[PDB]
Amino acid sequence: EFKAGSAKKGATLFKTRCLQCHTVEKGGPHKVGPNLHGIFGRHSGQAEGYSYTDANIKKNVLWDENNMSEYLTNPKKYIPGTKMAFGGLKKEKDRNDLITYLKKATE
């Protein structure tokens, strides 16, 4: 159960482990991964102009803070056969910080 974090450390966590494939803001370019704007309160594989794996669309989960934290532990376990080649944010306070920044930077 995620509760709160620091969008300051959450930003520095993103810049090192997320920024290579992703972009936040409104109207951000699709790089390797999709643009994460408005991800919270939006179903998996709904970003316009991006080609997702069948599995990402199959999952059909409304992205919430609890759904995201379970996913960011092991992305390949939560969604099997996904093209997100990321290990995972194992340390919970790392996820809690990231989601706090991600809940703000995705609007």
Ligand code: HEC
């Ligand atoms: C590549 C080097 C990636 C890194 C680092 C991270 N992500 Fe990723 N992500 C990547 C891909 C290729 C995809 C597409 C998934 C597919 O199977 O098609 C994604 C997807 C996401 C999603 C879901 C997208 C959606 O449902 O609309 C999320 C929420 C996501 N990625 C988050 C995320 C975060 C928070 C990361 C770092 C901390 C991160 N990704 C890293 C590729 C890569």
